[PDB]
A paper describes a structure:
The adaptor protein, speckle-type BTB/POZ protein (SPOP), recruits substrates to the cullin-3-subclass of E3 ligase for selective protein ubiquitylation. SPOP recruits substrates via its N-terminal MATH domain, whereas a central BTB domain mediates dimerization and interactions with Cul3. Here, we show that MyD88 interacts with SPOP through a long degron that contains the established SPOP-binding consensus and an N-terminal site that we name the Q-motif. We determine the structural basis of these interactions and show that the Q-motif interacts with an unexplored binding pocket on the SPOP MATH domain.
We found that the search motif is present in six additional known SPOP substrates – GLI family zinc finger 2 (GLI2), DEK, steroid receptor coactivator-3 (SRC-3; also known as nuclear receptor coactivator 3 (NCoA-3)), sentrin-specific protease 7 (SENP7), SET domain-containing protein 2 (SETD2), and Caprin1. We crystallized SPOPMATH in complex with the 17-mer substrate peptides and obtained high-resolution structures of SPOPMATH in complex with SRC-3, SETD2, and Caprin1. The SRC-3, SETD2, and Caprin1 peptides all interact at the SPOPMATH substrate-binding groove with the same overall backbone conformation as MyD88. In the N-terminal region, the backbone atoms of peptide positions −3,–5, and −6 make identical hydrogen-bond contacts with main chain atoms of SPOP Lys135 and Arg138 and with the side chain of SPOP Tyr83, respectively. At the −4 position, the SRC-3, SETD2, and Caprin1 peptides all contain a glutamine residue corresponding to MyD88 Gln130, and the side chain of this residue makes identical contacts with the backbone carbonyl groups of SPOP Lys115 and Tyr136. The SPOPMATH hydrophobic pocket (SPOP Phe136, Ile137, and Phe141) encompasses the side chains of peptide positions −4 and −5. The SBC regions of the SRC-3, SETD2, and Caprin1 peptides also interact with SPOPMATH as reported in other substrates, with the exception of the SETD2 and SRC-3 residues that deviate from the consensus at the +4 and +5 positions, respectively.
Numbering used by the authors:
A (entry chain B): 1364 to 1377
B (entry chain A): 26 to 59, 63 to 166
Write the structure that this text describes.
Amino acid sequence: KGSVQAPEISSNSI
Amino acid sequence: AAKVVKFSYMWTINNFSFCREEMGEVIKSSTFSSDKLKWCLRVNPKGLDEESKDYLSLYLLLVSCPKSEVRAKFKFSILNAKGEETKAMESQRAYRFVQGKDWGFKKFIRRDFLLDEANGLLPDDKLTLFCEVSVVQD
Ligand SMILES: [Mg+2]
Ligand SMILES: [Mg+2]
Ligand SMILES: [Mg+2]
Ligand SMILES: [Mg+2]
Ligand SMILES: [Mg+2]
């Protein structure tokens, strides 16, 4: 949201 | 008292400012080993989608395992110009990997924070990432 980082983890980056 | 086995991997990307990958394009690290597990890191310098285009994404891929699924936590951090691990983020818990499967942070670090020389994250135009993998043993 403008944040330096977001902690959400996700998959299937391909 | 689960049995966890931790190991650390360092990957340095050279001439990082000069990367021409765009949204969706990936840079893969070389494969690394933990116990017969093989891993690699995937980096999207400019994310994966319009959403994350202002961010660098970072993902952990399982390349090989000797049974079916692997359970692991992972921590990504960046080496700064003072010699310190910076901006660490970890999975709060273990994720389920199979061969071919990545897990990671689509929004790992804002590009304009990374490129800000004041934050010391690209010494000599090199981006050095650490990945600590914590594999839960069956
Ligand atoms: Mg390189
Ligand atoms: Mg390299
Ligand atoms: Mg390419
Ligand atoms: Mg920090
Ligand atoms: Mg899940």
